[PDB]
Amino acid sequence: RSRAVSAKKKAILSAALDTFSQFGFHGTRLEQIAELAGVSKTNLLYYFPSKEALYIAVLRQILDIWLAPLKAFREDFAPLAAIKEYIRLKLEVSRDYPQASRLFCMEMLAGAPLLMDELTGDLKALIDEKSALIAGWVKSGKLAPIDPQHLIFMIWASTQHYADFAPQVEAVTGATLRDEVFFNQTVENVQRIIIEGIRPR
Amino acid sequence: SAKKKAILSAALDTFSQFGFHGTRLEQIAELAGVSKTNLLYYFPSKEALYIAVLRQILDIWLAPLKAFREDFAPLAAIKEYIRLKLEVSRDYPQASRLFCMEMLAGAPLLMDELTGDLKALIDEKSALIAGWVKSGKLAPIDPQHLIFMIWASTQHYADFAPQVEAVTGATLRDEVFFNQTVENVQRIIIEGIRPR
Ligand SMILES: O=c1cc[nH]c(=O)[nH]1
Numbered sequence: 001r002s003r004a005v006s007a008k009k010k011a012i013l014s015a016a017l018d019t020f021s022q023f024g025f026h027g028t029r030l031e032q033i034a035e036l037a038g039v040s041k042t043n044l045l046y047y048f049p050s051k052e053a054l055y056i057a058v059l060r061q062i063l064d065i066w067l068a069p070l071k072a073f074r075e076d077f078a079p080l081a082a083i084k085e086y087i088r089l090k091l092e093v094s095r096d097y098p099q100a101s102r103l104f105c106m107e108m109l110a111g112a113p114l115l116m117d118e119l120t121g122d123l124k125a126l127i128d129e130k131s132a133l134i135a136g137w138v139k140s141g142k143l144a145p146i147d148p149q150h151l152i153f154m155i156w157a158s159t160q161h162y163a164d165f166a167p168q169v170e171a172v173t174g175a176t177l178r179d180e181v182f183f184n185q186t187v188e189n190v191q192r193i194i195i196e197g198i199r200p201r
Numbered sequence: 202s203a204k205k206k207a208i209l210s211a212a213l214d215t216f217s218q219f220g221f222h223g224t225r226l227e228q229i230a231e232l233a234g235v236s237k238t239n240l241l242y243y244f245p246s247k248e249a250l251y252i253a254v255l256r257q258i259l260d261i262w263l264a265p266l267k268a269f270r271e272d273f274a275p276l277a278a279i280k281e282y283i284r285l286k287l288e289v290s291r292d293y294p295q296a297s298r299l300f301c302m303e304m305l306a307g308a309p310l311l312m313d314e315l316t317g318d319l320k321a322l323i324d325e326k327s328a329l330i331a332g333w334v335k336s337g338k339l340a341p342i343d344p345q346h347l348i349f350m351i352w353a354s355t356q357h358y359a360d361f362a363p364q365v366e367a368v369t370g371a372t373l374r375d376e377v378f379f380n381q382t383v384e385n386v387q388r389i390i391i392e393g394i395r396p397r
């Protein structure tokens with residue numbers, strides 16, 4: 001309900017993200033996050049009672065940003081338009097918050113020791129629901145027959161790649177997503193491949 | 202050489218678990234059944250050994266793409282590449298994860314391999330695939346992005362295995378799920394690049 005409280009939380013989460021990125025979970029101290037955020041350590045602990053709780057909150061915030069378009073899917077949407085928009089929003093996040101994408105990737109590489117409950121609970125429940133929705137679209141003949149979970153994974157993988165594998169992308173192409181021309185070429189290619197791959201025939 | 206393979210295999214398992222800075226050459230030598238002196242004969246530094254491990258997964262990954270020739274059937278060639286890449290994610294997930302960790306770090310040790318030999322290969326094979334596009338044997342796509350989608354989509358199933366399992370109950374070590382994954386990744390990419 002409180003905007004001032006919400007802003008303070010965001011400031012702490014933003015400092016935590018940037019710190020957990022430069023130094024890792026075990027290397028990060030709460031005193032470093034508080035200092036970067038301009039808050040007392042006691043104020044930080046009021047909101048996030050441990051380093052573990054704060055780290056999980058940073059990762060839940062990235063999931064929130066990433067999943068917002070998919071959560072919004074309704075049976076009523078134009079499927080190919082909705083999926084196009086989803087791919088574009090995902091690439092914008094890789095362009096704008098690459099450090100979040102990398103932190104999430106690092107937690108996955110570690111076997112999701114702190115995030116596993118969020119994956120098996122709330123994420124699984126969401127993907128189950130939207131998979132049924134997408135399957136309805138297939139039944140209706142609005143999409144070619146594909147397994148929805150694999151479509152979803154393809155979208156995640158293809159768009160996150162440009163953040164997580166940025167040094168390789170740059171080595172190969174000379175560009176990153178912060179080059180506006182390259183950004184646009186990327187969107188156009190990822191969208192064409194996925195959309196023409198699921199368009200009904 | 203059987204010794205060199207033992208050292209590389211021990212190194213992969215150790216690095217992929219503990220990271221570069223956390224790994225000791227004494228641990229790798231012990232696992233490989235060699236002295237640290239004998240290890241250093243083959244690999245004169247931890248950096249050299251790490252780079253060797255990462256060049257080996259590059260070699261395995263790139264073999265199908267290196268084989269591409271102008272006169273191949275393009276959709277068939279790409280379809281086969283996707284399958285072979287998923288076989289690698291099933292069989293060598295630790296190597297995929299180690300390579301991903303090196304990328305997340307900004308490729309501090311691997312960057313020269315990426316800007317040198319990798320770039321040269323991708324330039325040659327991008328020209329080849331662009332010739333296929335020019336000829337109307339593929340849809341109007343940009344080859345580098347098609348290549349990146351293949352790498353991303355196939356490597357995802359190793360690198361993000363915890364999430365794939367949390368969501369689906371499966372991994373690529375489950376035969377039904379592996380077959381399903383190949384079928385679906387192939388269908389999306391191949392139908393997305395088929396000329397219309
Ligand atoms: O967009 C998403 C959502 C969940 N997990 C991912 O890897 N990406």
Ligand SMILES: O=c1cc[nH]c(=O)[nH]1
Nearest residue numbers: 165168259262263352
């Ligand atoms: O298959 C490959 C080859 C190079 N780099 C990757 O990420 N994947």
